[PDB]
Amino acid sequence: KKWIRGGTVVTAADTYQADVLIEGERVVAIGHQGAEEIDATGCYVIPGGIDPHTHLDMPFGGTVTADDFFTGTRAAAFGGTTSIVDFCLTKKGESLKSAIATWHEKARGKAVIDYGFHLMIAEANDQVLEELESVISSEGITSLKVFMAYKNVFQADDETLFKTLVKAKELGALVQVHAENGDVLDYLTKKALAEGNTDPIYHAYTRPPEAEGEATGRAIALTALAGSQLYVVHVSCASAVQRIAEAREKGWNVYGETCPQYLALDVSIMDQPDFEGAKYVWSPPLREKWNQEVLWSALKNGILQTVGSDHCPFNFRGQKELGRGDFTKIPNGGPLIEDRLTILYSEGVRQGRISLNQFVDISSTKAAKLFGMFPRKGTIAVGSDADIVIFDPHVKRTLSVETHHMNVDYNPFEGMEVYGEVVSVLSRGSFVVRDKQFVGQAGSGQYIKRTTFEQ
Ligand SMILES: [Mn+2]
Ligand SMILES: [Mn+2]
């Protein structure tokens, strides 16, 4: 039993001062007036963050992401994130269960926090459609990802997208899409290389906002025609939110997600002398700064509901470096898993962009609800897992590769002044991080079976 006292509990809806009693792996009592004491005076007691978008230990050519399920979850913990949902990638001629078994082996005995899996659908043939019933019912995976981009690699066509959408409505699954028109980007990419435009900045220029807008709109119309439910991952521009906002007005089950990088960074940082811009190469690419306001406005008024990181790190030296000759050879992705919460609090709450309660809803609660992990995770209430973060809102610090915990040689926020510091982190009643010190253990984290889609 653990007794957190003196702190101010903050959830998606409430804000009060009281003690929370933990017994075993869960919260068993909350209130005022024989247990492990933990002082949380002057700090916020919030639900551990939930990052529904990660790519830990992901392969890419002959190299792999700098972080694996161990260093990745440890960094996630230090950042105040207690649960993650990683993307299990599949390959045509795909046996969904073999890919799934592959992912469990990646996490098994390494994760320090709880994790769930999303399942990529490369193609929707009779076989895949049949297997799908077992994955949703037995494997606890109720979210499927379809790529509308990355031609000749992962891209799926409208037939695959639509079939998946009706199947998901039938089985109670949530469909996620990476929305960028794969074909227009493929054409623009080759063209840029033919004209000798090989600098990292052309990565951004070869995939215009409208390409994300078009794809976002298409996926939504297909969702409507199928009467299903859709979740658009990493929305980066005004063009895409506009389409999402429109569908929401019509009462369609369409949800959206953003990431720290699109909220606090912009394309102008890609235009740098040497090969510096390669540090910010990820898809979708950073956009013009005006788009940040639109995203923040959408999060404030409920147009977008979640915030993930899309953590997919590669060192600048030794990995990002493969693309020196041309941007298409630069492995995509950034080290974003650790600073998601803090920038959300510092740039969002402290600057009056969103309320403290929304802060919790956007970084934990809503993701738990959309991906079937609630009320086990995503809140502080009797019966829920004791996944708690003791956050110090009065701390001022600078984000730096010098002090971060991700196993990568750089931080995309290098030098950014922020408010807020994660002090202690509990995962199912056990300390993973205590007083800024790591006390967890590899393999402590567990797989979470997710329930079917619920509005
Ligand atoms: Mn993506
Ligand atoms: Mn991703």
| Domain containing residue 331: CATH number | 3.20.20.140
How much distance in Å is there from the Cα of 289 to the middle of ligand 2? 22
Sequence-distant (≥ 6) Cβ neighbours of residue 383 within 8 angstroms: 26, 27, 375
How much distance in Å is there from the Cα of 178 to the middle of ligand 1? 5
Residues annotated in a binding site for Mn(2+) = 53, 55, 145, 178, 234, 310
Answer yes or no: do 78 and 18 share one domain. Answer: no
Q: Which of 343, 375, 407 is the last residue before a domain boundary?
A: 375
Answer yes or no: do 365 and 394 share one domain. Answer: no
Distances (CA, A) of 6 to 19, 27, 322, 324, 378: 6, 16, 51, 53, 22
Which amino acid, residue 378?
G
Environment class of residue 278 by beta-carbon count within 10 Å: exposed (0-12), middle (13-18) or buried (19+)?
buried
- The full length of the chain comes to 455
Residues annotated in a binding site = 53, 55, 145, 178, 234, 310
Q: Which of 355, 375, 395 is the last residue before a domain boundary?
A: 375
- Strands across the sheet with 15-17, in order? 15-17, 8-10, 44-47, 388-399, 416-427, 430-434, 437-438
Distances (CA, A) of 227 to 220, 221, 252: 10, 10, 8
How much distance in Å is there from the Cα of 283 to the middle of ligand 1? 6
How much distance in Å is there from the Cα of 308 to the middle of ligand 2? 9
How much distance in Å is there from the Cα of 53 to the middle of ligand 2? 6
Residues with CB under 5 A from ligand 2 (ion): 310
How much distance in Å is there from the Cα of 231 to the middle of ligand 2? 13
How much distance in Å is there from the Cα of 138 to the middle of ligand 1? 26
Answer yes or no: do 12 and 143 share one domain. Answer: no
Can you give the CATH number for the domain in which 25 is found? Answer: 2.30.40.10
DSSP state of 400: -
Give the experimental resolution in Å.
Answer: 2.3
Quick check: 69 and 440 in contact, CB under 8 A?
no
How much distance in Å is there from the Cα of 334 to the middle of ligand 1? 12
Answer yes or no: do 327 and 284 share one domain. Answer: yes
Quick check: 13 and 43 in contact, CB under 8 A?
no
Ligand nearest to the CA of residue 54, numbered in listed order: 2
Quick check: 9 and 42 in contact, CB under 8 A?
no
What span, in angstroms and rounded, lies between the C-alpha atoms of 359 and 391?
13
195 C-beta neighbours (distance < 10 Å), count: 9
Answer yes or no: do 248 and 215 share one domain. Answer: yes
Which tokens is 190 given?
A: 């080759």
Which tokens is 321 given?
A: 């470096």
Quick check: 36 and 66 in contact, CB under 8 A?
no
Sequence-distant (≥ 6) Cβ neighbours of residue 167 within 8 angstroms: 124, 129, 132, 173
Give the CA-trace dihedral at 194, 195, 196, 201, to 10 degrees.
-110
Reduced to 3 states (helix: H, G, I; strand: E, B; else coil), residue 122 is coil
Q: Where are the alpha helices (DSSP H) in 35-157?
A: 69-78, 96-107, 126-137
What span, in angstroms and rounded, lies between the C-alpha atoms of 94 and 145?
14
How much distance in Å is there from the Cα of 63 to the middle of ligand 1? 19
What span, in angstroms and rounded, lies between the C-alpha atoms of 201 and 276?
10
Distances (CA, A) of 358 to 85, 301, 305: 21, 10, 9
Q: Which of 375, 398, 415 is the last residue before a domain boundary?
A: 375
How much distance in Å is there from the Cα of 93 to the middle of ligand 2? 22
Return the half-sphere exposure (C-beta side, CA atoms, 13 A cut-off) of residue 89: 14
Q: How far is CA 82 from the centre of its chain?
A: 12
Answer yes or no: do 271 and 163 share one domain. Answer: yes
Ligand nearest to the CA of residue 150, numbered in listed order: 1
What span, in angstroms and rounded, lies between the C-alpha atoms of 207 and 210?
8
How much distance in Å is there from the Cα of 17 to the middle of ligand 1? 40
Quick check: 218 and 158 in contact, CB under 8 A?
yes
Q: Where are the alpha helices (DSSP H) in 323-382?
A: 340-343, 356-360, 366-370
Ligand nearest to the CA of residue 149, numbered in listed order: 1
Answer yes or no: do 43 and 146 share one domain. Answer: no
Q: Which domain holds residue 414?
A: 1-47+376-455
217 C-beta neighbours (distance < 10 Å), count: 18
Give the CA-trace dihedral at 14, 15, 20, 23, to 10 degrees.
30
Answer yes or no: do 310 and 225 share one domain. Answer: yes
Distances (CA, A) of 310 to 217, 307, 340: 21, 9, 10
Answer yes or no: do 20 and 103 share one domain. Answer: no
Sequence-distant (≥ 6) Cβ neighbours of residue 50 within 8 angstroms: 81, 82, 83, 84, 85, 363, 364, 365, 367, 368, 373, 377, 378
Sequence-distant (≥ 6) Cβ neighbours of residue 365 within 8 angstroms: 11, 12, 47, 50, 374, 378, 379
Environment class of residue 129 by beta-carbon count within 10 Å: exposed (0-12), middle (13-18) or buried (19+)?
middle
Ligand nearest to the CA of residue 118, numbered in listed order: 2
Q: Radius of gyration over alpha carbons of the chain, in Å?
A: 21
Answer yes or no: do 274 and 389 share one domain. Answer: no
What span, in angstroms and rounded, lies between the C-alpha atoms of 410 and 416?
13
Q: Which of 337, 259, 339, 280 is nearest to 55 (CA)?
A: 337
Answer yes or no: do 35 and 94 share one domain. Answer: no
Ligand nearest to the CA of residue 232, numbered in listed order: 1
Answer yes or no: do 278 and 426 share one domain. Answer: no
What span, in angstroms and rounded, lies between the C-alpha atoms of 383 and 226?
36
How much distance in Å is there from the Cα of 126 to the middle of ligand 1? 26
| Cα distance between the two ends of the chain | 34
Sequence-distant (≥ 6) Cβ neighbours of residue 105 within 8 angstroms: none
Domain count, the chain: 2
How much distance in Å is there from the Cα of 15 to the middle of ligand 2? 33
